[PDB]
Amino acid sequence: MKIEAISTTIVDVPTRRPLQMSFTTVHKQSYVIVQVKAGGLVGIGEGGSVGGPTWGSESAETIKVIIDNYLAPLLVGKDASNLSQARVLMDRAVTGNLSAKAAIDIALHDLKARALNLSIADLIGGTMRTSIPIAWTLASGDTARDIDSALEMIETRRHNRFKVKLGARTPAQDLEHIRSIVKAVGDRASVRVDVNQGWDEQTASIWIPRLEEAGVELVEQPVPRANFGALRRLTEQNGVAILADESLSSLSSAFELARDHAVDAFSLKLCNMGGIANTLKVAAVAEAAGISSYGGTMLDSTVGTAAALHVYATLPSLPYGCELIGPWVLGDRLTQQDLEIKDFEVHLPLGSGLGVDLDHDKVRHYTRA
Amino acid sequence: MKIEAISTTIVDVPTRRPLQMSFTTVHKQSYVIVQVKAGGLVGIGEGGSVGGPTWGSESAETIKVIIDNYLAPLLVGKDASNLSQARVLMDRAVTGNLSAKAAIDIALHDLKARALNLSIADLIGGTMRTSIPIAWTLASGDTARDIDSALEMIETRRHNRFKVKLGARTPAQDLEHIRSIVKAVGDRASVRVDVNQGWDEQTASIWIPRLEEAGVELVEQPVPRANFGALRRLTEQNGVAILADESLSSLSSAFELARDHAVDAFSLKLCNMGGIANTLKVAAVAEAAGISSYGGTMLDSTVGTAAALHVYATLPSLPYGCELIGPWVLGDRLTQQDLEIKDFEVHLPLGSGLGVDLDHDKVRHYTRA
Amino acid sequence: MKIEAISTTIVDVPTRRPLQMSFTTVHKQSYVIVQVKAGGLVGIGEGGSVGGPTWGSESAETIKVIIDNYLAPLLVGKDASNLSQARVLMDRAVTGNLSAKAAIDIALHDLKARALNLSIADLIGGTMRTSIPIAWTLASGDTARDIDSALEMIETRRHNRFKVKLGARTPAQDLEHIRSIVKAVGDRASVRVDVNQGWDEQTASIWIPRLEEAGVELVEQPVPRANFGALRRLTEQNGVAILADESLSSLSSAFELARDHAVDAFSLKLCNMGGIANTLKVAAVAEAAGISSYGGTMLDSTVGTAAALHVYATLPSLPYGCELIGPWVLGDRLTQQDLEIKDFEVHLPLGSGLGVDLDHDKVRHYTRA
Amino acid sequence: MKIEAISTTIVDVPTRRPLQMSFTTVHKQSYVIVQVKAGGLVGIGEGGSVGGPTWGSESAETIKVIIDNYLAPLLVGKDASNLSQARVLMDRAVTGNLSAKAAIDIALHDLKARALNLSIADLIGGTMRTSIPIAWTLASGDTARDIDSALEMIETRRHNRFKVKLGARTPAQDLEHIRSIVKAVGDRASVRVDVNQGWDEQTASIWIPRLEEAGVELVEQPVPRANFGALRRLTEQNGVAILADESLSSLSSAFELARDHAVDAFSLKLCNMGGIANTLKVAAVAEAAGISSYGGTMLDSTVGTAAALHVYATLPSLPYGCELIGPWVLGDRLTQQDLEIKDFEVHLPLGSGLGVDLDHDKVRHYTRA
Ligand SMILES: [Mn+2]
Ligand SMILES: [Mn+2]
Ligand SMILES: [Mn+2]
Ligand SMILES: [Mn+2]
Ligand SMILES: [Mn+2]
Ligand SMILES: [Mn+2]
Ligand SMILES: [Mn+2]
Ligand SMILES: [Mn+2]
């Protein structure tokens, strides 16, 4: 059906815990909820970012303006079902702004899938799994608190995979923090870390081996995003798997990292990659090059999380599971239904499209003036 | 719907012209027509090969046995709509035999698309084009005859892109043959060549430059398929684009050729790559690496040709068009409808699924005893 | 003498123990027994594969059809003694299908050698050894059972070299399994492993060092066959020798692996390499590049095993011996005589040709209808 | 049969034309005729070298002493038919001295083949050809004389492939010399050159392109034998094929040149490579790496030439033919029969073994005191 209109709504949703960034602690996450109307039906999407233009160069503000002034005008009047043309049109009209493009792409997939009475995962080709082991990020900043948090998640059978943020304290302090957590969880959980580009090469070369010795199973983005050479050397010299996050963006960057096996795994993220088809292309490059696919997140609401789940549910292998905990870090929901986490895994919501619908009262409430 | 059964039928269809191979001239092409039955509906597919185990290691005989004894048994009872699982199940149960897997994959896509009332191209994401410039292969073995053939195709507006098979005669003879054709067609047509692995590196290094000087626009598989190093060196040293054909098979081989830009283009072929999803993964690697996608053929009947057209219709760019002339090299059709070539391009057949249906009377007639 | 005819017979021989494959446990091995008749005399060969199209893309079914429809017709009428021409004719007429070609090549060598009253090993140039240390594969799936099996083989002086299949259980479980076996056999036996492409690069990079520390002397195909880069990196970073199995096929692949010492050893296998001359060419590349030759097997019957023994008996060095235990895994014999294993080594059967003859009553009995 | 004795005889045979070397013009070639006696039968071999320790480090004198004092003593008492053990025993007892080893290896092959009533080519596996296009070396030092010589060889249908020695005169003079020859022979002959290590890299980089432009089809050893880097760069930058001669010796050197395609072709020479099996291993490496095999010569007598012919007759491809003209450069024959050159090719002598026998009266006459 012809696209009638594309609306963008910036919603500010409070987070249950503060978000420490550079030199400003955020108390909420901002999203751009996208709604595509065609043939009376509606498809929804989400344009995300972490704490503003910090994780990436996009923000809820840039996303809305990019869609409103450039992307939306170009798509109105076009066949909503032609996902191929929609993707190419956006790429040829706007450079970068992958998150804004992803919000629209997700909405178009939701709309098309519903029209066919299929889940997005089914539209893509079918599910390989209906649930995915999910990792919980421990970053309270306190060792004792993190240990209690982890033991709690394990006992309630919600999470037995944890990601610890490192880089803020000293390397020595980070190692002790990790050793304490590993000792506490024993053989009941796996521990991964994310240095968030916090170490230079020599620091990472010294401490990654110690992290591995301490029991760490995965080290995410230890060095600055542009330092592909350091990543490759660290990956070649260490047994523990290295995960690329910020180093990934375009399909080209995926190929570049893959070329000489600069990392062992790619953190797939719908928003930073530009959408579903684009994320699947990156996953194809990883599969072709012998690199693992990881289900990454941008602390998305239920809309973005559902979108990511449908994509990851179709991949052949997810050796490290996913980290789609956004809906639980937020203090409220923007959708009518909630996602389910049971027996250490997050479950794919049933139904056509994303399997989740916008709670207009919630969206209305959190819409920023 | 649950897969009820998968039938395989070897059909031998006479070719309008002989097929010179090694030391045996074939007078027909053999296909394995696959039919998947689920929920009363049927999806059709084709397992192809060129002149038997010559172009590749598979033949209509190996394909039928592989499907009957290994692949079919594993899929019966499974959800026909789960293309993801079907693809993975086949890959984990059988090594290689990509053509046999492709026949089943095409049938499953046809079945699923029809059930949704979509063309396969629409199911994949939507068309970027509804017609594709098509190249005609000139290989009568006679210069005068080829020139008449080309002028005829140009005047009737059927083809203005021609592929000349080289390697049989001497390099000097091949060059004169090419020069005569180029002089004859003038600025009304483009000339490409396929050496079919016929030259060693030094021979190719000497004559490719001469072919380029003569006006050739694309040189396909000049050296043996396993010689990736020679391909890379020839590609680095020559301006004329080099196309990989036999060197491509698995997704891994695509990545290997892409890694150091061993060629400028990949000849996509559904059967030698294992299916639609697999071919799309190869196309994604090419896109990621800056390598062109070419619509290749295995002299397929209308079934296989339609399948390939639906896939290529969705790709962002086809700088050299395609060569899906199989239906016109065959002396008869296996489908009820015929494909249309008009104004130098082959057109995507309208309708759901492949957009073509098996003419059971034709299939019955050419079925081998 | 002129080749009068080439017959193919598919025989299904029960195995003493089940053969766990993907998701189907096989209870027998299928072979294609080839018989070449020329000048009244007969030469025999075997076309093998492991559990069907699993280890490789060929099966007893594809092998028979390839020989019957393509290879056999081309050789009938040709001089059976011209092994050079026979090998080239097959390679130029059929792509791949090395196992089918190997069956015929073995038969031609047997026929020619007998006609000269020489063993095949003598025809090749002469023996360097008349017996070869043989490794027994422990894969009962139970640690206690494997330990009893090994101690038994050691005490009876049949085997003091064991190969343990890994990859099914978790890496941690595999390591404990290995540690238990090593502790049990002490200094009375050597332990090797075959991961059967079961690990990705990071997993192999972590556990191979642990296997080496545990006492493992050889690690076979730890990663997927197409991942030459991972093999090379693992080989460069680990002291324990890495053996290529599935990564080897064509002479070209041997050169590719050898180029940058991607592995320390090549598993020579007559069937997957295309025959005796082809296997000797691969061994020559290994010798030239400083890579070890290993006597590999495809769980062959006495016919294929005898063929392999004659070839390996002529090589200058076999630092890890061989694994030609096929005849003992089978529940019956297809030949009149049995091979002898004594004092930890398998002995070359005396006599001309292969030194073994087909028991027609046995072949007749196991011939599949 | 047990080897009874191995005799060595240095024979000095006058050449029809002088042999200009460094600063001493030789008027004859010296060979070491080897005779192996076992079970009453005799096998003959030849240890060659060009103009003494010039082309290589061996001479008829070193060869005789090496065989008499080291190799012969070790083989007496051993089974003459075990070619595998004979080859390994020699390699483990003596370093280098490949020509001396080759003389014995040829004799053992001759002896074994005769005992089986087979030609050496048949023993190796069978012939691919019974005649080989042969190149004649033009090196009279005079352009007019060379032109007459070539026209004569063409008209008598003896040779239409010529090799011109370069490097003595200036590059400019060599080019004019080549241009004159090419103009004279027209399309009736091909011209190759051998610079005999006479140019440094820059000189070769400038003139090889000019030689190619002038019509040269093959450039042999343009730079010093140890300069593999220069060879590779010249090979990468020029279309005309580059042939390695002096750069080849051990199997290791063959692999080294092959690794990065340092040359397009290898000049196979039985004496400088250590024998038949060793030469076949080098040919296998070339085949594996995509490098051409050329039938090289050391200006051998009929014995060495026959040996080389039997080997080259079995190879799959000889794109540049051979240069086995030794018997015609010599002023007399050491064998009872003469080799035949007809219709531009040299023919494989019929009969078992080498197909040629020593004329004891001739050998006796030319034996040096
Ligand atoms: Mn690593
Ligand atoms: Mn991260
Ligand atoms: Mn180029
Ligand atoms: Mn082609
Ligand atoms: Mn190593
Ligand atoms: Mn193995
Ligand atoms: Mn070159
Ligand atoms: Mn030379």
UniProtKB/Swiss-Prot annotation, chains A, B, C, D:
Q: Extract the InterPro entries matched here.
A: Chloromuconate_cycloisomerase, Enolase-like_C_sf, Enolase-like_N, Enolase_C-like, Mandel_Rmase/mucon_lact_enz_CS, Mandelate_racemase_C, Mandelate_racemase_N_dom
Catalyzed reactions per annotation: 2-[(2R)-2-chloro-2,5-dihydro-5-oxofuryl]acetate = 3-chloro-cis,cis-muconate + H(+)
Q: Where is the signal peptide?
A: none
Task: Select a single GO molecular function from the record's annotations and give it.
Answer: manganese ion binding
The metabolic or biological pathway listed in the UniProt record of this protein is: Aromatic compound metabolism; 3-chlorocatechol degradation
| GO biological process entries | 2,4-dichlorophenoxyacetic acid catabolic process; amino acid catabolic process
Q: Provide the alphabetized UniProt keywords.
A: Aromatic hydrocarbons catabolism, Isomerase, Manganese, Metal-binding, Plasmid
Catalytic residues (UniProt) = 165 (proton acceptor), 323 (proton donor)
Q: Which domain of life is it from?
A: Bacteria
Q: Where does Mn(2+) bind?
A: 194, 220, 245
Q: Which cofactor does it need?
A: Mn(2+)
Enzyme Commission code(s) on record: 5.5.1.7
Q: What else is known?
A: Chloromuconate cycloisomerase II is highly active toward chlorinated substrates but retains diminished activity toward the non-chlorinated substrates.
Q: Give the family from UniProt.
A: Belongs to the mandelate racemase/muconate lactonizing enzyme family.
Q: By what name is this protein known?
A: Chloromuconate cycloisomerase
Gene designation per UniProt:
tcbD
